[PDB]
Amino acid sequence: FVKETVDKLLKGYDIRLRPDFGGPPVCVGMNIDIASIDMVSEVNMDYTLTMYFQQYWRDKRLAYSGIPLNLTLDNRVADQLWVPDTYFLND
Amino acid sequence: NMSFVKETVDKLLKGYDIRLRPDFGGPPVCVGMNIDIASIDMVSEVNMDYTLTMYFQQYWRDKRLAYSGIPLNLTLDNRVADQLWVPDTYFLND
Ligand SMILES: *[C@@H]1O[C@H](CO)[C@@H](O)[C@H](O)[C@H]1NC(C)=O
Ligand SMILES: *[C@@H]1O[C@H](CO)[C@@H](O)[C@H](O)[C@H]1NC(C)=O
Numbered sequence: 001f002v003k004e005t006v007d008k009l010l011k012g013y014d015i016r017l018r019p020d021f022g023g024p025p026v027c028v029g030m031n032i033d034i035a036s037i038d039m040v041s042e043v044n045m046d047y048t049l050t051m052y053f054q055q056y057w058r059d060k061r062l063a064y065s066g067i068p069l070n071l072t073l074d075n076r077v078a079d080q081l082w083v084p085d086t087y088f089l090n091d
Numbered sequence: 092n093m094s095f096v097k098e099t100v101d102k103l104l105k106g107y108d109i110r111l112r113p114d115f116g117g118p119p120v121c122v123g124m125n126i127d128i129a130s131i132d133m134v135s136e137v138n139m140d141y142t143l144t145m146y147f148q149q150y151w152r153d154k155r156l157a158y159s160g161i162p163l164n165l166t167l168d169n170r171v172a173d174q175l176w177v178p179d180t181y182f183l184n185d
Contacts, residue, residue, distance in 0.1 A: 014093075014100070015168050015170060016168045016171050017093060017096060017097060017100075017167070018166075021096055022093070044133070
């Protein structure tokens with residue numbers, strides 16, 4: 001049952017378009033869990049940081065009504081989804 | 092509007108040959124350069140180089156990518172570049 005509901009989600013899904021493409025902006029929620037700062041260089045004036053960087057947003061194209069629980073899919077789904085173009089300005 | 096737009100984009104890329112520049116046989120493509128320097132991170136007298144970080148923006152016109160219907164500028168996922176023609180700009184002295 002579930003393979004089909006997922007397959008239909010991704011049938012015709014255009015990764016080129018954000019959620020609400022023409023519409024209002026997408027509220028993206030950031031959530032960071034710092035693992036470590038590994039190094040701080042006065043010589044190069046940088047530091048090296050390790051984190052878990054979590055993002056929450058809402059793509060109505062990925063709604064499923066039938067199932068009553070949260071679906072963890074293989075990481076390789078990202079390649080066939082739209083994700084925000086978040087980068088770190090000063091890296 | 093989302094379904095309408097996927098089609099207009101799909102038609103743009105229907106039959107689009109990335110091997111051909113704009114105006115393939117015709118006049119040259121005016122490419123506009125625009126640089127926003129972020130930082131120079133390092134300057135080496137020993138290796139006689141320097142390390143530079145920039146935003147490198149390019150503007151050109153590909154008539155194959157015109158759309159009349161839609162009333163805004165279309166920001167698409169970065170992955171579209173792989174299925175577009177882009178100028179072969181490099182840095183001679185890097
Ligand atoms: C499913 O996600 C919701 C929304 O974040 C959350 O409240 C809930 O705890 C999740 N389900 C389980 C089994 O934890
Ligand atoms: C689209 O870009 C042009 C610049 O070529 C600008 O004048 C115009 O206002 C932009 N459209 C929107 C919706 O802002």
